[PDB]
Amino acid sequence: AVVQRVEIHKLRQGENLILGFSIGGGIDQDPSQNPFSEDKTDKGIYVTRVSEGGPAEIAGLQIGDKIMQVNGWDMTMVTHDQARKRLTKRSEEVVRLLVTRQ
Amino acid sequence: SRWPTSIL
């Protein structure tokens, strides 16, 4: 895997700031169901979809990327909901993601 | 189904 660092500038969509991608995974989920991971014991957070033309795509995020950190916060041992919350803080317009890519 | 995803 290769380390990538992406800088997402969230888009205003109504009252919300959106990122333009979807996630799967988390320590509370069944890792054997993750179609993207090389190691099916990997309980990490993975990008499962990327919106064409959205903030994530523009920043260079790709389907299947594993999210290691968001704004310096470790994402390797969090629940699915904890990951969702970290990525979607309404006070944060810019989020930097450290990811690994196969 | 047994593996939820979330839109962000």
Swiss-Prot record, chain A:
- The answer to whether keyword Acetylation applies is yes
GO biological process terms on file: negative regulation of cell population proliferation; negative regulation of protein localization to cell surface; negative regulation of Wnt signaling pathway; regulation of Cdc42 protein signal transduction; Rho protein signal transduction; Wnt signaling pathway
Gene Ontology cellular component?
actin cytoskeleton; cytoplasm; cytosol; extracellular exosome; fibrillar center; intracellular membrane-bounded organelle; plasma membrane
Q: Kindly give the membrane topology term recorded for this protein.
A: Peripheral membrane protein
Describe the effect of K10A: Abolishes interaction with KCNJ4
User: Keywords, A to Z?
Assistant: Acetylation, Cell membrane, Cytoplasm, Membrane, Nucleus, Phosphoprotein, Wnt signaling pathway
Per UniProt, residues of the PDZ domain are 5-102
Origin: domain of life: Eukaryota
MF terms from GO for this chain are:
beta-catenin binding
Oxidoreductase among keywords: no
Q: Quote the tissue specificity entry.
A: Ubiquitous. Detected in brain, heart, kidney, lung, small intestine and skeletal muscle. Detected in various cell lines including HeLa. Weakly expressed in peripheral blood leukocytes.
Places the protein is found:
Cytoplasm; Nucleus; Cell membrane
Q: Which cysteines are joined by disulfide bonds?
A: none
Q: Phosphoserine (modified residue): where?
A: S51
Role according to the record:
May regulate a number of protein-protein interactions by competing for PDZ domain binding sites. Binds CTNNB1 and may thereby act as an inhibitor of the Wnt signaling pathway. Competes with LIN7A for KCNJ4 binding, and thereby promotes KCNJ4 internalization. May play a role in the Rho signaling pathway. May play a role in activation of CDC42 by the viral protein HPV16 E6.
Subunit organization: Interacts (via its PDZ domain) with GLS2. Interacts (via its PDZ domain) with RTKN (via the C-terminal region); this interaction facilitates Rho-mediated activation of the FOS serum response element (SRE). Interacts (via its PDZ domain) with CTNNB1; this interaction inhibits the transcriptional activity of CTNNB1. Interacts with HTLV-1 TAX protein. Interacts (via PDZ domain) with ARHGEF16. Interacts (via PDZ domain) with KCNJ4 (via C-terminus). Competes with LIN7A for KCNJ4 binding. Interacts with ADGRB2.
- State the protein's name: Tax1-binding protein 3
Q: Which organism is it from?
A: Homo sapiens
- In terms of the whole protein, what range is present? 11 to 112 of 124
